[PDB]
Design a protein that fits this description.
Chain lengths: 628, 123, 498, 52, 418, 186
RNA sequence: AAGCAGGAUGGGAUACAAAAAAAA
RNA sequence: AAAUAUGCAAUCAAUA
RNA sequence: AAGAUCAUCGAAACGGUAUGCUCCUGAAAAAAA
């Protein structure tokens, strides 16, 4: 305070740094509510307050210790409060479930049945919530439960984010007290919606900043399918309801102005979370400090990654990336070993000044980590523990080449280790400013090859075969890096592809081509979530581009890919068709496929549809040898 | 916006622009440039009817009423016609005609000294 | 997300506007992998869309192309079409940039050169010190530059030096840069030479190492009365010791010597000793050695055993897999240069002691190891690196099939020979060649134009004989002989070299 | 064969710029397809419909 | 304690005297009108904190940290924002209030701020002008006034800052670079050189195959170049260094410009060059109504006759607006940033293309209408300062919808109705 | 190829000066379609009502003087459009449309003839997927148009595009003094 | 420093030269 | 909020 | 479309009869201070 009573200028010279808070599980929150049951009851115009108190008492009785809400048939007929309470209860039950011999097996089967029932009830509750429109508190509770359970819905989340943004920016953000009893045991205790959202974990902030917000048509287009927009509705008049010649009498006989000149308003998107996302991105940037943990730097990297939206405007994003890279370079290898998959995967997407040095440091850390955990009996135990640690430290609400944010017997452990190693190799190869040396490339490839050989198929259900999604991702990363795929790892991946396609054929549940198209569509169906025409095209390109010049496996894989992609070739993006044709018209390709009539017709149709594409260049593009 | 000379739609019925650069002007300026650049036009073409308009190549002569009135006679009132030219029959932009005349004359652009271009409107 | 970005970019290039084309070209320039087919498509698209660009955008596109050396008929035609628009009211900076870009891209043609030369000659006065030095370097690099242009550059340099006369350092640097640029194209000038001699006499001690080397190179090229001789009485030993003490300074000195084409026995011996001493440090091996060895081999040291020992150092082979593909390519090029020197010495064209069977076997093993390591990294290289690798493989195959290599090494070398690297347009004098009746043929890694008392030291490789001048550089001679062998393989036999 | 000179380069000797060539081709096509209404003197009489 | 991300939308209060001392050039935007609305003549003035203000403060803090580290060491500068910032948006959002909040903070944190709230004053106010050969019109009185306004607060910092002798003695009378001034006279040179070359050719002819022709051509070209350079040297441009050869500090140059009216523009341009080539303090060139520098000025000349300008002189051709209209010079600036804001009080934004001016999309910051919370804070501040009379809490949302959150609309509506 | 053209659309616009006449024409068209010989349904077109136009001529009420007494003569027109799509029975449709006209009603016909271009290239049966060695070892509604809704959508979009083009061309080429070009000898 | 039934006015920058590891 | 840069008639969504 | 909103210059700085040069129509609105 100066002589005028004004705060000294030194109190506004700096901007504060943001901290982080743990994500308290809903089970712990419910236990705290149960413990505090009596205290809250004793602590608790007039009619409105009495109604609010009674509703709070009922909610406490429901959530904590007191035809019930757990009725599958009547789940679809629940109000907002009942739906959110049921969702919280289901999330708590899921968390608890996740966390002689015949009797034990029966108990395990019963637990599996209970988990399946809980999943079904969760899906029904999510559908009911999507049907209903939720308030700000309900939206926050739903979002918190989804974050805790790592169960995100592509349709429900945007509405919750919109409600959260509206409540945050409302004039009553810092004045209106919270009503739900669960907020009375929140750590830290927040008395306002803005305070609660500021307290939200950095993981939740990253989730809201990186919400997908895409449509199924866009997802299919990205995956490689031609998905034209839906045609607008049309209403054609009929002779049974044709307008009379004399419309003046018709208008006169009407009570009001039924018809007028065409006037139809269209809803315009109004910042569906694009402001709260920027606010949380600023929170993340300010959260970068030496006292922060890597478990928060990973969230900051997720915020600063490609993201659905550019939360940081202009120079704010490069500067945040540089600060995060400097902080990471300032940490030891032990502090980065637990968080290597997530950090590398997030930071390989961006290219800043410090990216090269940061990725060199991460390469050194990974070189140490592989030796420490035995990736180059006890070694198997070390690898299992390392994979479990990585997948557990992967932050909630996030995906790394299909790797979920949960825990991963020898074959299963080897499969998960191979997935982790493939993801790490892809993340390290994707980088633009950093080019890993052949020594490191060979080390990682050999580790992945050893894991694959340990896997069951090399040495059974669909979960035991490496996904074509991950295979295509790794092959695309290799193709873009500029290093030819090692023959051994290539053969292992080819064998995995053949085994999984054969298993799908065996277990698959006039029509000259309808059956083939149905089979291909089922194979690439979103339900499986393991195959994609783009992935098949990348696989074909990788096979067509081997080391410059075994053959049986290569030809078999190419024939299988051609059989899978041929029936639906006309239903794919032109880039995918071009890649398929170029790969199949290479020297290292089966001549029979290039001589089949179907292939010739497809090539001719593609050439007609793309006159600018020279036919001769096919088979000698994207770094391939032509069959000349 | 009360008296902004573009209408609400920012109409530029008299404006002309060069596609080679960002230079742009109007029809009166185009006529003045044509009268000033007779020598270039005559050289490209190659007491006499051909050169009868040479005297009008002087800036001072054009500034004088003796030349200003000739300029205004040559550049009339394309946006003023008969009173019946209203509604659907309101005058249209002669920018296309002016651009065609300029391109056929091969007059040089003041800012880039090019030969062609000179599309209609403003870029 | 599951799509091939190269294919998406290819289709966008096929169907893109000028702005999208510029963005795609920048992405290709900054990308890791380079596709010659994509470059050809980009050149064709530029030719199609030439009329829709502006002079600055055309200059930016030319610079983006020059980032990776590449040119073709479409680019040449577009440049010829838009040159007049470029040169309407030109600036000295624009003239210098256009001249440099034409020299780099090989756009040697009367239409593309004559107007630029006329504009530069007319606006010779407007150029400042830096622009004049750039023009001097570009003209020196160019082939058969005009005598009036050279004299104008010399007069401008002399006048700017007079106007100018830290300050001493800048004056010496400008003077001797211009002198070296003009000496690369030797001819008769007096005022600039006299000014340079006077400056050397006045400030001989103030010369830094790089300026002294430039002065020596210019004097040797121009056969001047004397400039180095005053510089000899300047205690250059301390400067050389300072340069050789630190590896970074050693690499800088090697780069400067390679650029100036300076081959002094004492300097080369001292540099070789410094390189051998620094090879003990692991840092020098990983960072400087791959390029230092190539620079030394290009400078052609008298003793060929030392480079062989440096290449065959066991720790170098141990660390080879950790080296980048560029470093492996540079080491292979150095090995190819050593092999060519050994072949010439054994055949009698050169003079000295050829490598003994022991060193030949060691070099063969190092070459095999480097090629085996590089084979899975071939795509991770630039077009220039691929062309150099192709020339090295051609030399190795000529030596071996015609020193032994493993079957895998032979197969990889044959693949390199049969590979496509998209050689750029060649550099030829505008006036001499009647471009109206010429074609282009891809020979080895270069494009050859085909039309339908000086001691002539000779060199031979694979069954060819040429009457090359006394001072023909190793890499240039090897590339010329490989190109002639490629032409023979193609079917062309009549070769004329001047 | 790969001739260095292109048809555009050969044409450039006469003085036909690519922009001028494009404009001339477009104008020729438009005159062929539409007509010769170039606003020459007396063209108003021919373009004006009769009313007898 | 400082300012956190959770403090957006709250008001920082300044004493009136302290605020005046911090902003001797006058408040930007129309905050003066709100101050006038305030009935009390002694209550502190409040300025709201917005997201754009906070982000610009963070950018400036990072810049200051990086440059302080570089000075202490005397790579990092690549990690700090260069060039500067452009503030754009709809009228009344608060772009000028952002600067009102920032500039005092920078000055308190010891930033050398060249602050101009009314660039249009140098193009719309009455003042004598004079044309130079380059094409710039000299405004001696306005340059003196600008130097005085700069010295109102930056006098001590300018005195402390040393002078770079290499940079000093390069600006012309109109302020343009000496090389540009030299180029401006090249035509008359060219003519004289042509005459001299004709005379020398006549002399050579009086004195009087392919080798001879080329030798004559080369000799004539060399003589032409020599004559060109001799005439270029003969050309002269007055310099202020003749009267002031050894200025101890940039404030000495500023005082010389203030005292001599014939050298005001040159002194201001030399101060600008020193600020460019200085590395002791963090410089910030702040302009409030940057878009007002380009439109035509009230001055009328016969050299701009036509439908494009109708005889008006473009404002950015005048000395001070031309100095203030440049944005890419922040790259030339070593230890400085440039923040420029737009204004649409007179003309609408229309097809505004700052990229043509030279501002990238990364440097553009958008300030929008008050959110519900910001509008509520604004109305609460107005009630506390007593600008409004008996405004009920029940109509807050109604009036927010009526005004659309725009600051100007809300202010005018609230003043009119309450 | 004349043999390949298909009557994509036939839009008949009945223009009448009397509501009774228009109603008679509509009823006659309905009856004609109701007795059309060949799932299969009569070629019912899509009705499209068009507005009513009017015109006035004003005269005085007196043979001399009295300008403030005036009389108005008002005329009327009506238009009604019916669209047939993918017309195969061209003769039947045209006969019905032309014989429906009653009284003084006239009709303006709008024909569209479409050619499909080169036929799409036929793709043979796609190759069948086989297990590998590893597996081995281990219209309905009455009165509605029978044509396809997507076909109708495409036809309508084409019609709207051509209408926009026609309006643009007419507006650009319109003149009050036809034949006059600016700066030409007037 | 207008207690105004007046009048006039409603112009953004662009093809440009201002802050002077490759014979690379 | 990397969405927009925002004045209104007397005809037309049975078609813009 | 105007009278708009906003924002400047501002009091006979209103008014616009009058005055040869210029523009539009038409075969024809000519001369003239
Ligand atoms: N941060 C703020 N604190 C207080 N008042 C503000 C703030 N931001 C805007 N206002 C109010 O809104 C208006 C701000 O006007 P200002 O000049 O800052 O706007 P602008 O966006 O620069 O517009 P212009 O295009 O007119 O230059 C004033 O009414 C001011 O009272
Ligand atoms: Mg403002
Ligand atoms: Zn132009």
């Amino acid at each position: 305070l100066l002589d005028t009573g004004e705060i000294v200028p030194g109190a506004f010279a700096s901007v504060k740094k943001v901290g982080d808070f743990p994500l308290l599980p809903l089970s712990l929150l419910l236990s705290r509510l149960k413990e505090r049951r009596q205290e809250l009851l004793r602590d608790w115009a007039f009619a409105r307050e009495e109604e609010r108190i009674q509703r709070k008492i009922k909610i406490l009785e429901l959530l904590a210790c007191g035809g019930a809400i757990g009725d599958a048939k009547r789940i679809a007929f629940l109000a907002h409060a009942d739906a959110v309470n049921l969702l919280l209860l289901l999330a708590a039950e899921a968390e608890t479930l996740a966390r002689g011999e015949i009797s034990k097996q029966e108990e395990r089967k019963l637990w599996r049945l209970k988990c399946e029932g809980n999943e079904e009830k969760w899906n029904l509750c999510i559908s009911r919530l999507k049907e209903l429109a939720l308030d700000h508190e309900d939206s926050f509770l739903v979002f918190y439960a989804m974050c805790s359970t790592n169960r995100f819905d592509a349709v429900l989340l945007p509405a919750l984010l919109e409600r959260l943004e509206a409540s945050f920016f409302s004039s009553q953000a810092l004045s209106k007290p919270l009503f739900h009893p669960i907020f009375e045991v929140w750590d830290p205790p927040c008395e306002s919606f803005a305070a609660l959202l500021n307290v939200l974990p950095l993981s939740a902030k990253a989730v809201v900043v990186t919400a997908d917000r895409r449509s199924e048509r866009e997802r299919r287009e990205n995956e490689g399918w031609l998905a034209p927009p839906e045609a607008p509705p049309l209403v054609l008049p009929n002779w049974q309801t044709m307008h009379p010649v004399d419309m003046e009498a018709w208008e006169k006989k009407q009570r009001r102005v039924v018809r007028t000149r065409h006037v139809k308003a269209k809803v315009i998107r109004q910042a569906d979370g694009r402001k709260l996302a920027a606010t949380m991105a600023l929170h993340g940037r300010q959260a970068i400090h030496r006292d922060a943990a890597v478990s928060s730097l990973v969230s900051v990297a997720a915020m600063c990654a490609s993201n659905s939206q550019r939360a940081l405007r202009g120079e704010l994003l490069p500067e945040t990336l540089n600060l995060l890279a400097a902080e990471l370079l300032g940490r030891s290898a032990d502090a980065l070993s637990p968080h290597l998959l997530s950090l590398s995967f997030l930071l390989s997407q961006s290219s800043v000044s410090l990216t090269e040095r940061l990725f060199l440091h991460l390469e050194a850390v990974l070189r140490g980590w592989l030796e420490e955990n035995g990736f180059v009996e006890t070694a198997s135990e070390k690898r299992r523990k390392a994979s479990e640690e990585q997948l557990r430290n992967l932050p909630p609400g996030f995906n790394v080449f299909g790797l979920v944010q949960s825990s991963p017997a020898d074959t299963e452990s080897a499969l998960w280790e191979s997935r982790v190693l493939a993801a790490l190799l892809s993340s390290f190869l994707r980088v633009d400013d950093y080019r890993p040396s052949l020594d490191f490339v060979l080390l990682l490839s050999d580790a992945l090859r050893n894991s694959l050989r340990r896997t069951a198929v090399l040495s059974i259900h669909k979960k035991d075969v490496l996904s074509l999604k991950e295979t295509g991702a790794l092959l695309s990363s290799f193709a873009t890096s500029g290093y030819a795929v090692p023959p051994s790892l290539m053969a292992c991946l080819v064998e995995h592809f053949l085994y999984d396609v054969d298993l799908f054929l065996t277990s698959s549940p006039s029509s000259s081509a309808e059956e083939a198209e149905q089979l291909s569509q089922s194979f690439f169906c979103s339900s499986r979530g393991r195959a994609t025409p783009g992935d098949c095209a990348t696989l074909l390109h990788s096979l067509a581009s081997p080391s410059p010049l075994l053959e049986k496996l290569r030809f078999e894989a190419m024939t299988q890919a051609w059989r899978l992609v041929a029936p639906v070739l006309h239903l794919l993006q032109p880039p995918c068709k071009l890649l398929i044709l170029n790969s199949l018209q290479t020297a290292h390709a089966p001549p029979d496929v290039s001589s089949t009539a179907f292939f010739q017709r497809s090539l001719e149709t593609f050439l007609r549809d793309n006159p600018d594409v020279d036919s001769s260049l096919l088979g000698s593009l994207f770094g391939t040898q032509g069959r000349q | 916006a009360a008296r902004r000379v573009g209408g609400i739609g920012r109409r530029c019925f008299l404006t002309l622009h060069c596609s080679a650069c960002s230079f742009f002007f109007q029809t009166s300026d185009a006529i003045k440039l044509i009268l000033t650049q007779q020598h270039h036009i005559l050289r490209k073409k190659g007491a006499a009817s051909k050169f009868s308009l040479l005297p009008l190549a002087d800036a001072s002569l054009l500034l004088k009423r003796r030349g200003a009135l000739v300029l205004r006679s040559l550049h009339g009132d394309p946006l003023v016609g008969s009173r019946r030219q209203r509604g659907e029959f309101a005058p249209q932009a002669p920018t296309a005609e002016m651009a065609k005349m300029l391109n056929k004359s091969c007059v040089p652009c003041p800012r880039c000294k090019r030969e062609g271009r000179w599309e209609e409107g403003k870029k | 997300r599951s799509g091939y970005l190269p294919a998406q970019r290819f289709l966008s290039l096929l169907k893109a506007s000028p702005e999208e084309y510029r963005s795609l070209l920048r992405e290709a320039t900054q990308a890791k992998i380079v596709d010659p087919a994509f470059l050809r498509v980009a050149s064709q698209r530029f030719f199609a869309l030439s009329d829709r660009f502006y002079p600055p955008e055309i200059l930016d596109i030319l610079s983006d192309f020059a980032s990776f050396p590449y040119s073709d008929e479409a680019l040449l035609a577009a440049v010829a079409g838009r040159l007049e628009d470029q040169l309407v009211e030109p600036s000295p900076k624009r003239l210098a940039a256009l001249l440099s870009l034409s020299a780099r891209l090989g756009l040697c043609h009367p239409s593309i050169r004559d107007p630029l030369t006329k504009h530069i000659e007319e606006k010779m006065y407007a150029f400042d010190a830096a622009l004049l030095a750039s023009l001097c370097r570009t003209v020196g690099s160019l082939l058969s530059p005009r005598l009036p242009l050279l004299d104008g550059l010399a007069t401008q340099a002399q006048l700017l030096a007079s106007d100018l006369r830290v300050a001493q350092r800048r004056y010496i640097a400008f003077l001797f840069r211009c002198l070296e640029g003009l000496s690369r194209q030797r001819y008769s000038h007096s005022a600039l030479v006299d000014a340079c001699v006077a400056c050397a006499e006045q400030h001989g001690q103030a010369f830094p190492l790089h300026d002294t080397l430039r002065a020596v190179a210019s004097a040797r090229r121009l056969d001047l009365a004397g400039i180095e001789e005053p510089l000899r009485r300047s205690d250059m030993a301390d400067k050389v010791n300072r340069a050789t003490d630190r590896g970074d300074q050693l690499l800088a000195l090697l780069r400067h010597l390679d650029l100036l084409r300076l081959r002094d026995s004492q300097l080369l011996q001292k540099v070789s000793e410094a390189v051998e001493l620094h090879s003990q440090k692991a840092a020098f091996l990983a960072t400087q050695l791959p390029e230092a060895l190539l620079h030394l081999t290009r400078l052609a040291p008298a003793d060929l055993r030392l480079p062989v020992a440096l290449l065959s150092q066991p720790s170098l082979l141990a660390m080879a897999p950790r080296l980048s593909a560029a470093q492996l390519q540079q080491l292979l090029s150095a090995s190819a240069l050593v092999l060519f020197q050994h072949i010439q010495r054994r055949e009698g064209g050169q003079g000295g002691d050829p490598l003994i069977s022991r060193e030949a076997e060691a070099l063969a093993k190092t070459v095999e190891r480097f090629l085996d390591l590089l084979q899975p990294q071939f795509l991770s290289l630039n077009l220039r690196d691929r062309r150099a690798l192709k020339e090295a493989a051609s030399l190795f195959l000529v030596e071996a099939q015609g020193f032994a290599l493993a079957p895998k090494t032979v197969d990889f070398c044959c693949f390199l020979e049969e590979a496509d690297v998209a050689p750029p347009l060649p550099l030829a004098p505008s006036g001499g060649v009647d471009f109206q009746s010429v074609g282009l043929v891809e020979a080895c890694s270069r494009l050859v134009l085909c039309a339908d008392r000086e001691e002539t030291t000779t060199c031979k490789l694979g069954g060819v004989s040429t009457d090359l001048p006394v001072s023909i550089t190793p890499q240039a001679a090897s590339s010329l002989l490989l190109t002639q062998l490629a032409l023979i393989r193609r079917g062309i036999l009549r070769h004329e070299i001047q | 064969m790969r001739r260095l000179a292109s048809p555009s380069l050969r044409r450039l000797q006469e003085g036909q710029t690519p922009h001028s060539m494009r404009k001339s081709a477009v104008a020729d096509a438009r005159k062929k397809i539409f007509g010769y209404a170039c606003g020459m003197p007396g063209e108003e009489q021919w373009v004006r419909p009769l009313q007898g | 304690g400082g300012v956190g991300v959770e403090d957006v939308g709250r008001f920082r209060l300044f004493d009136r005297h302290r605020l005046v001392e911090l902003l001797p050039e006058g408040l930007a935007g129309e905050l003066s009108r709100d101050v006038e609305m305030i009935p009390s003549a002694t209550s502190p003035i409040g300025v709201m904190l917005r997201k754009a203000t906070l982000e610009l403060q963070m950018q400036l803090e990072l810049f200051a940290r990086v440059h302080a580290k570089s000075s202490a060491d005397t790579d990092a500068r690549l990690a700090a924002v260069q060039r500067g910032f452009l503030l754009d948006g709809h009228r009344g959002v608060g772009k000028s209030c952002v600067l009102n909040y920032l500039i005092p903070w920078a000055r308190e944190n010891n930033w050398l701020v060249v602050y101009e709230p009314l660039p249009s004053r140098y193009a719309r106010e009455i003042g004598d002008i004079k044309r130079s050969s380059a094409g710039v019109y000299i405004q001696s009185s306005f340059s003196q006034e600008f130097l005085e306004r700069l010295g109102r607060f930056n006098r001590r910092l300018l005195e402390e800052l040393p002078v770079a002798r290499r940079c000093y003695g390069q600006a012309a009378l109109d302020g343009v670079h000496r090389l540009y001034a030299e180029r401006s006279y090249h035509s008359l040179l060219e003519k004289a050189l042509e005459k001299d070359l004709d005379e020398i050719r006549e002399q050579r002819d009086e004195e009087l195959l392919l080798d001879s022709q080329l030798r004559e051509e080369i000799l004539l070209a060399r003589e032409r170049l020599a004559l060109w350079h001799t005439y270029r040297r003969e050309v002269s441009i007055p310099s202020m260094k003749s009267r002031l050869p050894n200025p101890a500090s940039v404030w000495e140059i500023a005082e010389f410009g203030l005292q001599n009216e014939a050298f005001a523009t040159q002194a201001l341009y030399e101060v600008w060059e020193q600020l460019k080539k200085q590395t002791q303090l963090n410089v910030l060139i702040a302009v409030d109504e940057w878009n007002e520098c380009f439109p035509v000025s009230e001055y009328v000349s016969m050299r701009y006759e036509g439908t494009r300008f109708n005889g008006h002189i473009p404002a950015f051709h005048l000395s001070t607006p031309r100095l203030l209209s440049r944005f890419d010079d922040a790259q030339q600036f070593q230890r400085g940033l440039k923040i420029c804001a737009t204004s649409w009080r007179r003309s609408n934004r229309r097809d505004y293309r700052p990229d043509l001016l030279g501002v990238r999309q990364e440097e553009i910051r958008t300030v929008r209408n008050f959110s519900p919370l910001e509008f509520a804070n604004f109305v609460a501040y107005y009630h506390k300062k007593k600008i409004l009379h008996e405004f009920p809490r029940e109509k807050l949302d109604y009036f927010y919808m009526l005004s659309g959150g725009n600051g100007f609309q809300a202010r005018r509506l609230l003043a009119s109705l309450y | 190829a004349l043999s390949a053209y298909s009557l994509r659309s036939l839009i008949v616009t009945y223009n009448s000066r009397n509501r009774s006449s228009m109603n008679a024409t509509i009823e006659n068209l309905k009856n004609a379609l109701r007795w059309t010989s060949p799932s299969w349904s009569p070629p019912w077109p899509v009705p499209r009502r068009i507005g009513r136009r009017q015109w006035r001529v004003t005269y005085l009420k007196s043979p001399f003087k009295y300008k403030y007494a005036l009389r108005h003569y008002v005329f009327e027109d009506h238009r009604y459009a019916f669209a047939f799509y993918d017309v195969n029975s061209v003769q039947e449709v045209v006969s019905a449309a032309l014989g429906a006209m009653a009284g003084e009603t006239c009709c303006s016909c709008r024909f569209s003839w479409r050619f499909a271009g080169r036929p799409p290239v036929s793709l043979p049966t796609p190759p069948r997927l086989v297990p590998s060695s590893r597996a081995a070892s281990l219209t309905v509604l009455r009165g509605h148009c029978p044509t396809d809704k997507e076909f109708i959508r495409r036809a309508l979009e084409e019609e709207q595009a051509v209408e926009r083009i026609r309006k643009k061309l007419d507006k650009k080429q319109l003149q009050w003094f036809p034949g006059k070009t600016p700066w030409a000898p007037k």
